Amino acid sequence: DRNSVDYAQIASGIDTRTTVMIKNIPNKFTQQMLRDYIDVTNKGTYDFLYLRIDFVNKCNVGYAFINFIEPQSIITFGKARVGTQWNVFHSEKICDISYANIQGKDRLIEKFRNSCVMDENPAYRPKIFVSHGPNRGMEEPFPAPNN
């Protein structure tokens, strides 16, 4: 499909999309567990991260948005994790990815800055990180509502 990830197309430079959906996330996985999981192989390679929590059902939504700074970092993540089991909470689910319909850190910021999710516990809010320079990967304060 239009959102399937093909590592060879990324390597050859014919698909430069950077926003990816991390799929089949176990119900009880947290955003901290996801950040740590990604940091095993991809620390400092992404500049947007969000795993939405459903507070009523005590679970995450099952997928996360991640914006990689360089499209090549999708190969690093994918080749290490895609097709492997999460191996937490006795889940049978496997890590998988596809491209998101929304593309880029700026579009992601604009999608959540005015959202009601910014009113929840600061620890569970979407995150942005420095995209370039010596501090690349360091968390940045999320921009305030545009209204």
Numbering used by the authors: 580 to 726
According to the publication:
Upon meiosis onset, Mmi1 is lured by a ribonucleoprotein (RNP) complex, composed of the nucleocytoplasmic shuttling RNA-binding protein Mei2 and the DSR-containing lncRNA meiRNA, that accumulates in a single nuclear body overlapping the meiRNA-encoding sme2 + gene. Both Mei2 and meiRNA are essential for the assembly of this structure and the completion of sexual differentiation. Interestingly, Mei2 mutants lacking the RRM3 domain (residues 592 to 750, hereafter called RRM3Mei2) failed to accumulate meiotic mRNAs, suggesting that Mei2 RNA-binding activity is required to inhibit Mmi1 function. In this study, we show that the RNA-binding activities of Mmi1 and Mei2 are crucial for their mutual control during mitosis and further identify a lncRNA, termed mamRNA, as a major regulatory and bridging partner for both proteins in the nucleus.
To gain insights into RNA recognition by RRM3Mei2, we solved its crystal structure, which revealed a unique organization as the classical RRM fold is extended by the N-terminal helix α0 and by one helix and two strands at the C-terminal extremity. Using isothermal titration calorimetry (ITC) and size exclusion chromatography coupled to multi-angle laser light scattering (SEC-MALLS), we found that RRM3Mei2 tightly interacts with a poly-U15 in a 1:1 stoichiometry.
